[PDB]
Amino acid sequence: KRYEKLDFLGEGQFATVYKARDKNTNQIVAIKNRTALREIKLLQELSHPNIIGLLDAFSNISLVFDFMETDLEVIIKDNSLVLTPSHIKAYMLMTLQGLEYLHQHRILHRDLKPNNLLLDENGVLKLADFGLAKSFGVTRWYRAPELLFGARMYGVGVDMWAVGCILAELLLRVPFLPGDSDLDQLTRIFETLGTPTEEQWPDMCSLPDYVTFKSFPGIPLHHIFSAAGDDLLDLIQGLFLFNPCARITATQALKMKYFSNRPGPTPGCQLPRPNC
Numbered sequence: 001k002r003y004e005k006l007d008f009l010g011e012g013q014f015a016t017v018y019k020a021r022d023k024n025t026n027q028i029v030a031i032k033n034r035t036a037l038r039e040i041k042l043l044q045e046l047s048h049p050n051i052i053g054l055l056d057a058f059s060n061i062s063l064v065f066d067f068m069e070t071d072l073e074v075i076i077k078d079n080s081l082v083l084t085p086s087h088i089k090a091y092m093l094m095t096l097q098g099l100e101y102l103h104q105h106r107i108l109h110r111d112l113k114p115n116n117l118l119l120d121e122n123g124v125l126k127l128a129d130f131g132l133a134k135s136f137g138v139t140r141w142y143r144a145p146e147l148l149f150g151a152r153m154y155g156v157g158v159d160m161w162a163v164g165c166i167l168a169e170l171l172l173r174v175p176f177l178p179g180d181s182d183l184d185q186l187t188r189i190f191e192t193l194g195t196p197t198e199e200q201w202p203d204m205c206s207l208p209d210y211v212t213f214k215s216f217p218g219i220p221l222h223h224i225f226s227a228a229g230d231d232l233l234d235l236i237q238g239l240f241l242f243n244p245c246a247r248i249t250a251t252q253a254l255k256m257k258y259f260s261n262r263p264g265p266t267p268g269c270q271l272p273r274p275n276c
């Protein structure tokens with residue numbers, strides 16, 4: 001009861017979400033089970049500016065997170081907005097910084113997609129929905145080629161491919177590889193980026209469900225991302241490498257010249273806030 005609800009925010013799988021002012025602090029919050037009670041454990045553990053804060057939780061349960069004004073899917077979907085190189089850079093920086101933190105804490109998100117990359121009123125992006133997240137101990141369109149094949153030994157490359165997919169959608173403003181089966185998703189990856197050889201991939205055929213695909217050459221990235229410079233083409237190139245050992249980590253992505261080159265990232269206050 002330490003909170004009292006103000007506005008309905010949504011329905012879904014896990015309970016309903018409700019906007020509230022916390023009685024004591026006057027701060028505004030949002031208020032949400034083995035598949036959820038490991039999520040409750042995991043999120044009260046962590047603290048990062050770019051990770052959703054689980055503030056309280058208390059079986060019929062309600063889980064107080066930060067309140068978030070919007071998400072990247074809204075921003076992507078919104079025609080009233082133009083994204084500038086500096087908005088994109090700021091968005092990918094916060095995404096990757098939040099990710100780097102999780103992966104140094106030996107956690108995979110496994111459900112990166114733009115509707116999970118929430119934003120506050122002060123332009124701070126926070127990764128949300130750790131219901132698929134697991135310790136090292138996603139929907140088709142952000143899913144890595146290896147996962148579509150059938151790899152269960154898999155790593156950070158799973159989350160890194162999705163970041164490429166989200167990055168492309170920041171640029172094109174449309175899903176990059178929008179497949180309508182798990183095979184159509186491989187068909188789409190291999191016509192756009194080219195069919196990987198086993199020189200593009202050392203132990204590929206050892207996958208239980210590796211399959212002999214049509215040998216496409218792919219579209220060059222400069223044709224797809226025409227407005228991107230060589231520094232951002234290298235970021236996109238790194239994220240989309242088929243070998244999950246070659247594929248760039250959040251850390252290698254963040255030490256990439258792209259984030260140190262001009263134009264720099266937009267401050268949160270000046271990131272494009274939408275209306276409903």
Ligand SMILES: *CCC(=O)Nc1ccc(C(=O)Nc2n[nH]c3c2CN(C(=O)N[C@H](CN(C)C)c2ccccc2)C3(C)C)cc1
Binds near residue numbers: 014
């Ligand atoms: C102007 C219109 C507008 O911006 N509307 C709007 C404002 C705010 C929200 C909102 O839900 N805010 C919010 N604050 N903290 C949270 C949220 C949503 N949320 C979730 O966890 N939501 C997830 C949805 N995933 C797919 C990102 C959810 C919700 C229910 C069940 C499962 C998953 C938290 C609690 C982080 C919405 C619209």
